Amino acid sequence: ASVYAWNRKRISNCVADYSVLYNSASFSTFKCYGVSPTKLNDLCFTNVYA
Amino acid sequence: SALGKLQDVVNQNAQALNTLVKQLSSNFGAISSVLNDILSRLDPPEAEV
Amino acid sequence: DSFVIRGDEVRQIAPGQTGKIADYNYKLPDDFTGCVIAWNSNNLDSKVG
User: Fold this and answer.
1) How many CB pairs under 8 A join A and C?
2) Which residues of chain B are within 8 Å of residue A35 when distances are taken between CB atoms?
3) B41: which chain A residues are within 8 Å (Cβ-Cβ)?
4) Can you say whether residue B7 is alpha, beta or left, with left for phi > 0 and alpha for psi between -120 and 50 degrees?
5) Changing residue 28 to F: what effect (chain A)?
6) Phi and psi (nearest 5°) for A19?
7) CB 3.0–4.6 Å: which of A50, B5, B8, B35 could bond A9 by disulfide?
8) Is the dihedral of CA A18, A27, C36, B47 positive or negative?
9) Contact (CB, 8 A) for C20 and A23
10) Is residue C19 a contact partner of residue B47, using CB atoms and an 8 Å limit?
């Protein structure tokens, strides 16, 4: 979608492995704020928006 | 109230300890007052700060 | 220490980083005291095909 019409997807009831995404050179930018991108697999989340 | 001079002393010490305990809830500028929540979320370069 | 990687992986050569290169190829300590230098070697280390 266009940047002014940014799309939002709710993510819940699913396990995800953000380690294969940080280890991917396909992503030109991977920057996290308030939580380290490395230590992600231990964290447990209650509401995820994309 | 006849023994207030001693009861107040007891209260003062209890109050001091309660204040000290309450001091554990303060952030002091940190992202969280809970040390375990910082340790589980940040890499050393930021967790140490 | 000298080696060759590709540009998208240069972000892994830093203290406290994780990834294919940082975890399985070349790991820098958290207390690393030194320098990291990198330059584009396309004219030397790239081959057609």
Assistant:
1) 14
2) 41-42
3) 34-36, 39, 43
4) alpha
5) In strain: Omicron/BA.1, Omicron/BA.2, Omicron/BA.2.12.1, Omicron/BA.2.75, Omicron/BA.4, Omicron/BA.5, Omicron/BQ.1.1, Omicron/XBB.1.5, Omicron/EG.5.1
6) -85, -30
7) A50
8) negative
9) yes
10) no
